[PDB]
Design a protein around this ligand. Structure first.
Ligand SMILES: *[C@@H]1O[C@H](CO[C@@H]2O[C@@H](C)[C@@H](O)[C@@H](O)[C@@H]2O)[C@@H](O[C@@H]2O[C@H](CO)[C@@H](O[C@@H]3O[C@H](CO[C@H]4O[C@H](CO)[C@@H](O)[C@H](O)[C@@H]4O[C@@H]4O[C@H](CO)[C@@H](O)[C@H](O)[C@H]4NC(C)=O)[C@@H](O)[C@H](O[C@H]4O[C@H](CO)[C@@H](O)[C@H](O)[C@@H]4O[C@@H]4O[C@H](CO)[C@@H](O)[C@H](O)[C@H]4NC(C)=O)[C@@H]3O)[C@H](O)[C@H]2NC(C)=O)[C@H](O)[C@H]1NC(C)=O
Ligand SMILES: *[C@@H]1O[C@H](CO[C@@H]2O[C@@H](C)[C@@H](O)[C@@H](O)[C@@H]2O)[C@@H](O[C@@H]2O[C@H](CO)[C@@H](O[C@@H]3O[C@H](CO[C@H]4O[C@H](CO)[C@@H](O)[C@H](O)[C@@H]4O[C@@H]4O[C@H](CO)[C@@H](O)[C@H](O)[C@H]4NC(C)=O)[C@@H](O)[C@H](O[C@H]4O[C@H](CO)[C@@H](O)[C@H](O)[C@@H]4O[C@@H]4O[C@H](CO)[C@@H](O)[C@H](O)[C@H]4NC(C)=O)[C@@H]3O)[C@H](O)[C@H]2NC(C)=O)[C@H](O)[C@H]1NC(C)=O
Lengths: 208, 204
């Protein structure tokens, strides 16, 4: 019969003011004979009516996929409000309910450390500037780099990794030509996370 | 019924003494006919050396493990699992391979704890593995001729030239680093000489 999956907002969407955090209720394996899906959305048990339900779409496997999207308020998601999708369909014994919210565990803020290129790397034509983000919970986080007060767009960041103490770490890094580092330019690693003061911190990195 | 084909572990692929194997797993086989046999293919030629596991149902799985030749897998020969069952329009095939393209070796750099981390009780020793292809790799830590196990390693990340990089973090007590112990990051990857390299790190 029909199955239901309930997805949380993307991390940047929860942490950035100009972005739209959304919870997504997806229903799959909907038959031809019982094609109609109904959604009811609840926020800490109160029903809301402004979600946006997409029309059913037949999939290559001859079943329907129906999707409902509820936009969540930034503050509500951060306060741990619970979002419940309820799906009704006649091929089901009872309506299926799924609930999602922010990770439950005690919040912990990131420690942010900047690491200069390895000595052995200095012999190359590009070097790596590293930023270690450590010990944060929940795993929702966003990292950016800047040079001389302006965005750097050529950096990469690992996904969060689960650590032994139950928190998360990641590494971000920026690769730059050796002359640029050698000159004494300043680079900065910026982190947005809910548990930081102002949900933001910045640490800097520069030739010694 | 649907078919999933899983690859060998990286170390099994890179060490002559180990047995690299691909796994063909079928997932939703009807009780109306729980009958399925496999035909395993290697570059269009069929093999008969696959060994089916002791089948075992669960509330709600048939698997053939094919041992692959070390060089064949490295040369990216195609391993095609073919699954037959009466609930199928056609017998269905899944094909698996090592990622195609010329291998590029990782560069391995060892990184000391940030000065700001030195205030803390435990510190992070970092190993940067950079620019490798394909992403199959294994990373480990050692101290004083013996395995060190309180490390974590990120997944490989795709970078702009199409190769991969990752970081591995070893956590140790601040005093222990402070004594002058030597720690080591070892990496296994097909493009390395002897498929192995090691870089080391100790207090200056
Ligand atoms: C018919 O087709 C559709 C397939 O659609 C498409 O068309 C078919 C024809 C093929 O072409 C497909 O290739 C193609 O996808 C089939 O529907 C699929 O059904 C399976 C389940 O049978 C669903 O799998 C679930 O996937 C989620 C993760 O899914 C995200 O990532 C997928 C890529 O891997 C991506 O395809 C999905 O779209 C989805 O992507 C996310 O989408 C949201 C909203 O759009 C977006 O915001 C996200 O950013 C985006 N993410 C990404 C990475 O892009 C996976 O999590 C589910 O697994 C969990 O749940 C199950 C039970 O517990 C169980 O199956 C698993 O064990 C796993 O369990 C969970 O563990 C987590 C750990 O945290 C825990 O939190 C959970 O609580 C726990 N349990 C539950 C219930 O969650 C599951 O794997 C596919 O999503 C679905 N595809 C689509 C597009 O909806 C359909 O099955 C086909 N029917 C048949 C008969 O073949
Ligand atoms: C009935 O239950 C069975 C039993 O399932 C298991 O046990 C039951 C009791 C419950 O606990 C289950 O929740 C639990 O799964 C169900 O069987 C499952 O069926 C789903 C789909 O139907 C399969 O999902 C796929 O899983 C693989 C990853 O699988 C590894 O990790 C699993 C955890 O999710 C682990 O459980 C698996 O065993 C497997 O582990 C690997 O196994 C090998 C063999 O031993 C081993 O060597 C490895 O070490 C081991 N690895 C690890 C880490 O342990 C995942 O790859 C699939 O995603 C692919 O397919 C999706 C749909 O096809 C697609 O959306 C994804 O994007 C992705 O597709 C691939 O995408 C890339 C690029 O995008 C492309 O290159 C690929 O070509 C493309 N592939 C395809 C096909 O398009 C997906 O998540 C479960 O594996 C399967 N598990 C078992 C044990 O059978 C069964 O479905 C249930 N039936 C019903 C009707 O409910």
């Amino acid at each position: 019969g029909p199955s239901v999956f309930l997805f949380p907002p993307k991390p940047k969407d929860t942490l950035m003011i100009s972005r739209t955090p959304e919870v997504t209720c997806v229903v799959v394996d909907v038959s031809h004979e019982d094609p109609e899906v109904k959604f009811n959305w609840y926020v800490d048990g109160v029903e809301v009516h402004n979600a946006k339900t997409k029309p059913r779409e037949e999939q290559y496997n001859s079943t329907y996929r129906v999707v409902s999207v509820l936009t969540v308020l930034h503050q509500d998601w951060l306060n741990g409000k619970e979002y419940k999708c309820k799906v009704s369909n006649k091929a089901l014994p009872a309506p299926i309910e799924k609930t999602i919210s922010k990770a439950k565990g005690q919040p912990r803020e990131p420690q942010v450390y900047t690491l200069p290129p390895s000595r052995d790397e200095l012999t190359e034509n590009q070097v790596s500037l590293t930023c270690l983000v450590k010990g944060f919970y929940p795993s929702d986080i966003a990292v950016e780099w800047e040079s001389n007060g302006q965005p750097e767009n050529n950096y990469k960041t690992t996904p969060p990794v689960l650590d032994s103490d139950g928190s998360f770490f990641l590494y971000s890094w920026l690769t730059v030509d050796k002359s640029r580092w050698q000159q004494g330019n300043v680079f900065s690693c910026s982190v947005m996370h809910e548990a930081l003061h102002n949900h933001y911190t910045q640490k800097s990195l520069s030739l010694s």
